[PDB]
Each structure stands twice: as C-alpha cells, then as structure tokens.
C-alpha cells in the first residue's frame, strides 16, 4: 500500500517522497511511481542505486 512504500523507500534509500502513485500490472507485479521531494535531487540518488 502507498504508505508502506513511502516509509520503506525512505528506510531503504536517502529518498524522501512527495507523492506516491501506484498501479497493478497485468503480469502480477506492482508499479510505483515515487515522486521525489526537493530535499534531495533524484539523479545522483538514482546513479548510486543504478
């Protein structure tokens, strides 16, 4: 659920989340768009994770 993802992402990475949108795919996997806050800037954090 969205709340759990937001907490989880903050725990797992330096990310803080402005808004989290989710969708259930056909294949059985959930896809979460996590919109980053201006507290950090995504590109570096993305580069570090992959």
């Amino acid at each position: 659920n969205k709340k759990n993802i937001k907490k989880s992402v903050k725990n797992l990475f330096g990310i803080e989340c402005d808004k989290v949108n989710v969708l259930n795919t056909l294949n059985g996997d959930k896809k979460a768009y996590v919109r980053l806050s201006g507290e950090h800037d995504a590109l570096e954090v993305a580069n570090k994770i992959g």
Partner: protein, 43 residues
C-alpha cells in the same frame, strides 16, 4: 469492458502469462496453447 473486478483482472493476466511459448534453451536439453480470437477464455 473498461472496468473489471480485481480477481478477474488478475486472472486475465494469469491467462496471458500462461500463453508465453516454451523457453528456447529448454528445447536443447508446445501442445497446449490459448489463442485469443477463436478460442475464448470463457471464465
């Protein structure tokens, strides 16, 4: 339709997943296959 109930959507995905052909490396060690147009899922 546009809308579905979650169980039905998940099932439609399951059938779609089921279709996927046999993996090509496996043959180097099919008979049953959904095709959408003439062979309805029905469920």
């Amino acid at each position: 339709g546009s809308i579905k109930r979650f169980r039905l959507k998940q099932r439609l995905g399951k059938c779609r997943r089921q279709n996927r052909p046999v993996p090509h490396w496996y043959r180097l060690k099919n008979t049953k296959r959904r095709h959408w147009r003439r062979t309805k899922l029905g469920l």
